[PDB]
Paper text:
We also crystallized PrgE together with a single-stranded poly-A 60-mer DNA in a molar ratio of 1:3. The obtained crystallographic data were refined in the space group P212121 with the asymmetric unit containing three copies of the protein sitting on a string of 15 ssDNA bases. Although there are only 15 bases in the asymmetric unit, the ssDNA shows a continuous density throughout the crystal packing. Compared with the apo structure of PrgE, a few more residues are visible at the C-terminal end (until residues 136 of 144), continuing as an alpha-helix as predicted by the AlphaFold2 model. The DNA does not get wrapped around PrgE, like it does with E. coli SSB; rather, PrgE interacts with the DNA like beads on a string, with the N-terminal tail of one PrgE binding to the neighboring PrgE, using interactions between polar side chains. PrgE binds to the ssDNA between loops 1 and 4, where the beta-barrel is partially open. Each subunit binds to five DNA bases. The binding also bends the ssDNA between the protein-binding sites, resulting in a kink at every fifth base. Many interactions with the phosphate backbone of the ssDNA are the same within all subunits, including with residues Ser33, Gln34, and Asn37 in loop 1 that form H-bonds with the DNA backbone with the fourth and fifth phosphate of each stretch of five bases. In addition to hydrogen bonding with the phosphate backbone, pi–pi interactions between the aromatic rings of the DNA and two tyrosine residues are of major importance for DNA binding.
Residue numbers in the entry:
A (entry chain A), B (entry chain B), C (entry chain C): 1 to 136
The structure:
Amino acid sequence: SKYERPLKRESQIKEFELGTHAAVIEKVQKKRSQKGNDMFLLSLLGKSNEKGVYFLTFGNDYTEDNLRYILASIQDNGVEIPDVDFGYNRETFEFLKGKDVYIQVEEQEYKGKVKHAVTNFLTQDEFEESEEMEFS
Amino acid sequence: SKYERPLKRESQIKEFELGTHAAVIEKVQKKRSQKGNDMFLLSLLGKSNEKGVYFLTFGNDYTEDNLRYILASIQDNGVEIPDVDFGYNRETFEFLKGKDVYIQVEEQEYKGKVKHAVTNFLTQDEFEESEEMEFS
Amino acid sequence: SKYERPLKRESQIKEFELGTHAAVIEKVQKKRSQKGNDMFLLSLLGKSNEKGVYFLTFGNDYTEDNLRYILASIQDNGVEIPDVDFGYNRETFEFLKGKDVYIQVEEQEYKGKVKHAVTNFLTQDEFEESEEMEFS
DNA sequence: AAAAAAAAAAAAAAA
């Protein structure tokens, strides 16, 4: 094919350790998956510069519930959830950017490659239940 | 099978230190993989005779982008890109030879043996971002 | 059990010193491995009566490559490679006998016992390049 | 809960 300038790629030097972490959604991209689903690609920034990615895929039974947990995590980091129809729309897209969240980070295999993946957005209850088990 | 001069093999004494470097594509070579994929074998040379190799495999869905990043790295080193169809062809083969590039080199574990392998080709943006964080 | 006459064993008094060497393929004999692959057993005679052995083992992914390098070594000693199918056949078998080659010999250890073994066949440029860095 | 993902490349064998 003919050359077409490709995009700058973000350096993902450092992953999240396994467990629960406070993180901020440092970026939100609108993309389409390889199987042709509309998704929001949440980029996640930790307090020691840990980078992580999360895919909010649309057009299935879980999408609604999935996003409610993202919103609930935002709510419990001290932000009011506005009166808007949440889903595949610009309000939702813009609302997520820059927000404090609680994330879970589990291991995950794919093509025999193990990485630390962001799996879930946690409520206050879930974040503390997990965090109050750790010994300094 | 009928005879086919195998590719000359060099002394891999000095390899690239970890991180990102300016390099040249010293040699390009046609080669069939163990799984039976066509690839170009890019020999990279550094400013103090560090050596490394890069496997540009054809067939995969990443081929295009992977080559795009090679080309874009060449673009950002002062060479302009011809209006040719880039791929598994002769023009591509001849173009890549003797071109200044930006590369990343990470640690790569394979069957016990860790070694410093060229992983990516970097754009100007990518390159300056990681090179500007070094001190004196 | 019942006595069968055993075969004469060739006197392997002196072995190659480590490094690169001009040598002749003095003998070639096809055998079965302990694991049970067909293979050629190249005997190699040095210019000071050094004796070494090389095992070209058939039935693996790199059989053809290892053979190609042998032929390349013969090619670069003033011999033209004919348009023959190279492999486990009589023609390849008989072509190898008596040819000049360049060999590499390294230390090797099987059952505690150390041995100078023939590990590779070198091209012209490969041979000269090894001889360059010996003078230092 | 369902869906997301850079793919691919590396001697093996002899004794």
